[PDB]
Design a protein around this ligand. Sequence first.
Ligand SMILES: [Zn+2]
Lengths: 77, 351, 351, 232
Amino acid sequence: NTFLSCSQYHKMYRTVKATSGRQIFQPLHTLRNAEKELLPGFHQFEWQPALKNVSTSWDVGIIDGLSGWTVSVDDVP
Amino acid sequence: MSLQPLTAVNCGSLVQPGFSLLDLEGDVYLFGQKGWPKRSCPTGIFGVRIKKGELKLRAISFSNNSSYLPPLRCPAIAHFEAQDGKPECYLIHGGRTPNNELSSSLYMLSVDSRGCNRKVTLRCEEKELVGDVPSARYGHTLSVINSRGKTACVLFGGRSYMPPTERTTQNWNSVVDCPPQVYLIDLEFGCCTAHTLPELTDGQSFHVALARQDCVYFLGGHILSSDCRPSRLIRLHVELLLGSPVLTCTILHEGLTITSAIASPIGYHEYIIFGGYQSETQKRMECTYVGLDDVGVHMESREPPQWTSEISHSRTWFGGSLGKGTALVAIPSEGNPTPPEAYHFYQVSFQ
Amino acid sequence: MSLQPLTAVNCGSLVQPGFSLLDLEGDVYLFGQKGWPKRSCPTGIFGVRIKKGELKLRAISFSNNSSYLPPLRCPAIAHFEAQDGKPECYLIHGGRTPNNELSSSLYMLSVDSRGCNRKVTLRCEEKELVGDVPSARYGHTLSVINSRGKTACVLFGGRSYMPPTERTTQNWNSVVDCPPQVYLIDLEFGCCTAHTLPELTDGQSFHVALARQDCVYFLGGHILSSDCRPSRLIRLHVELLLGSPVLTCTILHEGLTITSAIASPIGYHEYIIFGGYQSETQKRMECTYVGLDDVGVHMESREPPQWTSEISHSRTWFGGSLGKGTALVAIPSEGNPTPPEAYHFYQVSFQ
Amino acid sequence: IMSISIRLEGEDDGITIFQEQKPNSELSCRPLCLMFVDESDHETLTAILGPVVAERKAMMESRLIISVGGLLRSFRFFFRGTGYDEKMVREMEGLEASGSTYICTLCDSTRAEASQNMVLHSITRSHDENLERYEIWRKNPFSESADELRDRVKGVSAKPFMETQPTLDALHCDIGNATEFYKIFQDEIGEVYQKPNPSREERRRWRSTLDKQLRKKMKLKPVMRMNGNYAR
DNA sequence: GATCTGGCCTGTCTTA
DNA sequence: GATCTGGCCTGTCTTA
Ligand SMILES: [Zn+2]
């Protein structure tokens, strides 16, 4: 919410810990596992009746939108 | 065998990677365009004239009693030649709607009247198919056969989307080869029969098919199961008798390993295979000649016209046949800002 | 009285808010180009022609003996009329170069030869002033008098940069009115005398000065000390009698409250005054007529032409006198994208 | 997510629970798909967005089950497509963009017809009716010429693929109306009802003096394309 | 050579 | 009416 870049935040963390720390802020690698709940593909859910033409796997994260294009040359690329 | 660089002065955004060139009654008609029809041309079909290097596209208008067509991207064109009763017919089936779908309907295109002043009116009719209809597909091939003495059509090959039950919103734009059965279609009525091929255990696509005197010869076509481009040639023989359309088949040992070739007619039955893709990276540069007689295919490589560095180093290329030993090819272009003409055009001529 | 808009045909980017129109021998010459002289016209001076609304600028060329001029922005122009020796002269002094410094050098401009094919050659001679030179200033006025029978010049008014004691790099760009002493300059030689008079309390700037028959009439200037635009009319009477150019002065009742006016001669000694500004905020809209004779100045309000809403709602406006009852006015123009032509132009004509 | 309400056990059309107090805010707008695709071309846009519209059209039917607040609860979904401007609504419903004869996306009135008659019109257009009308235009059962057939389907020449609720965008409506009034003022600076054929230079001079005035007062500087702040 | 009409071209209008 | 010359016009090159 303060639009701080990851590398700028790590800079802030190192500077606030090296001087008088007594470290307050958490390191990056504990943030990277902290949001695994906020992103999609974490909670269990289920429809009824089962959806049409949609798979039932409930853990699909970021999927590439091309959706299985047969990149082979001769078709529309 | 010389190539002339053309300028697509105006209307160079209507051509797209896959499209068709119908050669009927002299002048050629471009068919297929980017997006749906715009009000400049409410039909979708342009007339092409090449003069002094200029490529000029003119708007064509349909007749009063004809239905209209979506701009099918990669359809299967079959040239039904002049005879009783309505020359000159083109059978189109079935292609890809620009709203990305597969159309399973067959269209029949013909010429109606003229001029008054250098104007041609066309007419399109949907042809209802009572079947046993072949599943909607693109890239397949249709060919007309005349046998003792009646007329039929042979439909073979092509790809299609995943079966309707197994298509998942992640495998949506996935595409697999349709099963390998040959469909015999009567022009009228819509009785279409399906027959199995004991020798062909797999289908293909993008294979140039040449039909002469109730014999059909299928050149190589790209297979997506094994990712192989077979050099073998396929011959099939349709013997139309009352009332079972028996079909037989055989393999020829050697043919050109080619996919998406521009098959331009020159002589009576002599064609030139103008080139395409032999591997996923390298494109065919050599021009080949294919004469067709009842003995078999006679194949000789001919001196390919000297290609400028641009068309020799291009990633991909496509085109179509303007007829009379003349063909059109296109190369996508780069630059900044937009050219905006995304395609440079070349006209290759034989003899 | 009439006005016509003029189209600012190409090369209209050389007109800046302060500039001069030197009217000599038919066509008039724009002077005071924006920026330094670009090698499109290495002189700096232009001939102007107005034909069917088109304002076309041609590049004049100096002669071999001439020293070259920097494009001063707002100098003091004095028209020395046609007589012995070399008619007719324009005295330019002194203005400020495109680098913000003040010239303090008197230049004399004359014509040399023509044509052949619609070509006119000029010549600029810098003339030395020995003295007791006048301090570098801009906006002042110089006027030409003929007194029994010697020709002299009276130099008065004008702002200047602060003296080089209180000059401070925080008060660098500030200007203050030069001390009010009249300088009498001989055309030849450069012997310049300086006289002071009690009735002239402070100097002025941008005050139109008129000169006839060894008498000079100063209209209302703009005094920067009390911020007043005095409506007093000033008169001074000089005579060059060996060996002093003895000078006296008088105040008059009514003088117009305009600064930076466009004084166009129309009659023998009758002028039409267009005016720049009545007050700091509100510009002058009325046009006035000022005749002058041995008795005194005679004022008459003449009907001003109907102004377009644009030139009536303009904040600032400038121009000069093309002569012969014709004058040229300019309006800065606001628009996005940049027009780029900044100044829209009008031609006003009397009778 | 605009609002979430409860109905059970019944007797109430709804009993609202959560209503987004700031719908237009940038803090409440959840991205779903990002693409590097042009808007003009149709084939790439539809090939990528096929699946999204497909599972959206398949989701309206069934009911979701989530473990929330400790218990298993059931949800229904209503989708309202309203955030598209007119260009995209026209091109994704089969109409002709954008200066056609058939002006209204909600009605069938033509450009000249809604000039005489202005204030009386009734909303007709909908998704299914446009699908059926594309079917009429392609099958062409009565065999009319191009213009008559275009008149029968009131200008549906392409198959619609996305469904769009018949509403009006607010922001671009304000921008369009402010550009209309800016042309009216640009006309009224000069006299256009006295001199009906003004020259191009006169147009430029009128726009220049109007922008000069609108700079002296209201503290505005002109813009090439007119954003919404200039309209307000 | 006189006639004509299809289509080419150009300017304004509309939402972006 | 022929001739001549200045200035107008356009394309390319240079840093931005
Ligand atoms: Zn409406």
